[PDB]
Write a protein that binds this ligand. Structure first.
Ligand code: S8H
Ligand code: S8H
Lengths: 306, 306
């Protein structure tokens, strides 16, 4: 019945986006309860970015130097503080649209939706993964900083990403909502470069199970393998090593399809060595790795939110 | 700075989704002002679907036989009528969350976002195109009928698709909001099968311009061609014929990149004949055709909505 890269409905987060201007820098912030979260580099000019001293740059800032606009209303800033690489701007009015929410730091391989924003206004929504090198492959232009990533489980919004930087290679880096960068990146315009972008093996496997459900089965070979032998072939193709926990997590997909996880590993092996010879799997000629096992289950059964 | 399949923020449409039950059939409807739109096959059982007589099946239905639930509130139905293949259920209260909106019938090759719903609740959001054979390649399971497709231009929601059917081949068919199917499909469970799924040439070209902007340029060959000669090669590869209007529409992308449209056509020709030899363009090993020229411009400049 089809399988698609699908983000969470975004309406909940839309009503949390505001515009933050400090000096001549404008970007997005996240208004939850009576606090606005935003990247601390809002206080930097374009000169300041090669070597910012954030503590020093902050000294010359007062509550009234952060202008925060929701649609066309100014919120009054009644306090502000730096936490790691984010600013938390206390405002005098709780967002009436605040959802049930929490802050989560996700693991590499985990997926989430990004609401890309400019000047506090939503532009669009798409699904990302936290790559193993702790970048993400997004779509962000000047002024997108402060856009967030999230997951939704029923009525509860889990915020896991804030956008801060684009590296020379055009991939993207950012923090959790406590202001800690994912990976080794820093909010400085310097020589920092991403490591090997390895493939999230367990997510590829999840997606092959997804394909089987939806009718693409040509790749279902007639072998099985072992974790150790499969990983010797994953290594050379820059695939993340597959663990027993990963096997466990696929157990549900294994049980719905009747195909043992190691059998699927054998099929994947043969795809890595022999190619797809021009074939397609769910309308991709590449092996997709930004679906989690939970994503597959969700989409193939119809889990809802509100 | 990255390029991604990106849907419109969905919050506006979320607040229009309700649950419609008639008899033992439940699906989604769209509540705008004091009217709820939904697929007329809500009134059919699973037996009724091989050969429904909708006019006859409707005779035994009254306003009180349609139960409409918004979250956990019942709307009172004060009138109902069939329009083509949709029912319009007049309710006694205007949706207070109704956006500025209009109904548009889109052309093949045009793109839109789908908010997939189950039991009146949002499940996720993704971007589709109206294919030239008038199917779409979505993600829809039992109970997703009534989910809608839309575009947003600033504050105005243009609804263009309602989901009704999944064909034996696992692609999807549906109507505009006036209840007219796209293409030759009917709301009957019979032998109807999609035609040739040709590729939307102009959108492929748009996406190559997108790639050039974002750094992927290896395919920029050193030829040019003519519309007529390029189309003789598009034909055999089941590509939609390229017209002058299509050339005109790419004019803006041509001007930003400095690459003439016919030069891009020559590059595409060479890709169709020689393949991608394992290379990638914007992280696809296939030529993508569900971005419009307007989509590219939008995303590469940062157009916002609210
Ligand atoms: S987000 C819903 C919930 N948070 C949790 O307890 C997380 C565990 C599950 N995801 C769940 O039970 O939903 C909650 O009540 N959050 C309220 C809230 O706004 O918390 C903020 C930290 C203030
Ligand atoms: S949707 C905004 C507008 N509709 C138009 O006039 C379409 C042309 C442009 N997209 C635009 O000007 O935005 C409008 O005022 N719609 C109001 C509305 O709800 O209309 C329904 C038909 C009732």
């Amino acid at each position: 019945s089809g399988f698609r890269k699908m983000a969470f409905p975004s309406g909940k987060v839309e009503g949390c986006m505001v515009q933050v201007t400090c000096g001549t820098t404008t970007l997005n912030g996240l208004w939850l309860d009576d606090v606005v979260y935003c990247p601390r580099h809002v206080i930097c000019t374009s000169e300041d970015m090669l070597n910012p001293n954030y503590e020093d740059l902050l000294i010359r800032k007062s509550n009234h130097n952060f202008l925060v606009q929701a649609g066309n209303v100014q919120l009054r800033v009644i306090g502000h503080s730096m936490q790691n690489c984010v600013l938390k701007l206390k405002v005098d009015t709780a967002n009436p649209k605040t959802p049930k929410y929490k802050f989560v730091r996700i693991q590499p391989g985990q997926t989430f939706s990004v609401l890309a924003c400019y000047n506090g206004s939503p532009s669009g929504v798409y699904q990302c993964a936290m790559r193993p090198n702790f970048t993400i492959k997004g779509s962000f232009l000047n002024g997108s900083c402060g856009s967030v990533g999230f997951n939704i489980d029923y009525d509860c919004v889990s915020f896991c990403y804030m956008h801060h930087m684009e590296l020379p290679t055009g991939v993207h880096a950012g923090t959790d909502l406590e202001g800690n960068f994912y990976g080794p990146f820093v909010d400085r315009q310097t020589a920092q470069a991403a490591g090997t972008d390895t493939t999230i093996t367990v997510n590829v496997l999840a997606w092959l199970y997804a394909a089987v459900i939806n009718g693409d089965r040509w790749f279902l070979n007639r072998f099985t393998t072992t974790l150790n032998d499969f990983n010797l072939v994953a290594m050379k193709y820059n695939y993340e090593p597959l663990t027993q926990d990963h096997v466990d997590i696929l157990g549900p997909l294994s049980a719905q399809t009747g195909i043992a996880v190691l059998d699927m590993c054998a099929s994947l092996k043969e795809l890595l060595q022999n190619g797809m010879n021009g074939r397609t799997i769910l309308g991709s000629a590449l092996l997709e790795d930004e679906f989690t096992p939970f994503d597959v289950v969700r989409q193939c059964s119809g889990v809802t939110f509100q």
